[PDB]
Amino acid sequence: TALVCDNGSGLVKAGFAGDDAPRAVFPSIVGRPRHQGVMVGMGQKDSYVGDEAQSKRGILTLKYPIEHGIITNWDDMEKIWHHTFYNELRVAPEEHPTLLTEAPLNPKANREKMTQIMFETFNVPAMYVAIQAVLSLYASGRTTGIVLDSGDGVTHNVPIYEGYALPHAIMRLDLAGRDLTDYLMKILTERGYSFVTTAEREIVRDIKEKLCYVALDFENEMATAASSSSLEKSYELPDGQVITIGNERFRCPETLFQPSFIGMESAGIHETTYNSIMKCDIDIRKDLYANNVMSGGTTMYPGIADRMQKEITALAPSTMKIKIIAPPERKYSVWIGGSILASLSTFQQMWITKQEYDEAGPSIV
């Protein structure tokens, strides 16, 4: 059977086509040691991937090999792809068709390099690479719609008709998980605190998951922040510092809607939906609006879907019939979409064989 492997900028999820829910789920980090010391009962080790990269981070420096949707470094990608099979999944590549995911609408060479390294270094009998937002539409179990796939690096509004994007409206904005934590980090220093290590930047990254939320209306939320302590939510910062976070808790995740808040020349996410759709053919738009679907990391925020209903309806003509879906499982949607499609009998023919590599070469798809 086959393996599906969502390479995030920050999270890499993998498993056997057949199950509902992914097996290997690890941070996309390659760490590297900061001093010649011996690990307790190990060789010194040149690098650390995912999880042991995460725990041994302090004595380390951590690079992520995927930034903003791009695989940037290609060795550190191999270390991730290795850490899947030979560490997380307990498998040998040549046993398995493998599938990986990519950022709405491809050319060639970065996929060539993906396809290449698969069949050569690892020797997987088959590969397929399939679209990240479009696979969230496959997870949502429909054809048409507009996805907002926003992970660590890169958000995407993707409008779709048939299985594919109506791609001319796929706005990127590289305003996403990373710079959202950078805001929380600043607005807590502003609040009177400090943070130094990347571990501490994880603890920031973390308060983002647990305490940062999306109001239905910012202006009334700033008002209720100014009225009652109600919004303040403390948390024991591991050391000790039970810190209070109040108006910040929305003033960070807001950043999708206001890049002005970090100080960037982008219009907000709420508007980019309308503009992507206005860029598209005009009547099928109705279907697109009716299936606005969300996915990834930064889409996990408490309130974001109902607020997208306030916002996008005020942008669009009132009779528009807009409907935002955002799967409860959404961190894994690209993989749910993946497992099922990889396991699909009418799609079994579409996989890239080993054979097609050895004859036709890396730019197969």
Q: Which of residues 155-214 bind a copy of itself (CB under 8 A)?
A: 156, 161-163, 165-168, 170-174, 190-192, 194, 196-202
DSSP string covering 70-103:
EE--SHHHHHHHHHIIIIII---GGG-EEEEEES
Instruction: Report d(CA 323, CA 330) in Å as an integer.
Output: 16
Instruction: Choose the binding region for a copy of itself from 46-54, 75-83, 89-97, 99-107 (rule: CB under 8 A).
Output: 99-107
Instruction: Report d(CA 314, CA 154) in Å as an integer.
Output: 25
Q: Which uninterrupted H or E stretch holds 116?
A: helix 109-117
The distance of closest approach from Cβ of residue 5 to a copy of itself in the complex, given in angstroms and rounded to an integer, is 15
The distance of closest approach from Cβ of residue 90 to a copy of itself in the complex, given in angstroms and rounded to an integer, is 28
Of residues 18, 58, 74, 75, which one binds a copy of itself by CB under 8 A?
A: 58
Judged by CB under 8 A, how many residues of this single chain contact a copy of itself? Answer: 76
Is 323 a binding residue for a copy of itself by CB under 8 A? The answer is no
Instruction: Report d(CA 211, CA 248) in Å as an integer.
Output: 10
Only one residue has tokens 């090999």, namely: 65
Comparing CB distances to a copy of itself, the nearer of 61 and 92 is 61
Q: Return the structure tokens found at 288.
A: 């697109």
The distance of closest approach from Cβ of residue 260 to a copy of itself in the complex, given in angstroms and rounded to an integer, is 10
The distance of closest approach from Cβ of residue 247 to a copy of itself in the complex, given in angstroms and rounded to an integer, is 13
- Are residues 295 and 136 in contact, defined by beta-carbon separation less than 8 angstroms? yes
Window 10 to 49, contacts with a copy of itself (CB under 8 A):
35, 37-38
Comparing CB distances to a copy of itself, the nearer of 89 and 225 is 225
Window 204 to 263, contacts with a copy of itself (CB under 8 A):
236-241, 263
The distance of closest approach from Cβ of residue 103 to a copy of itself in the complex, given in angstroms and rounded to an integer, is 5
Only one residue has tokens 């109001």, namely: 215
Closest CA to 129 of 103, 93, 100, 107: 100
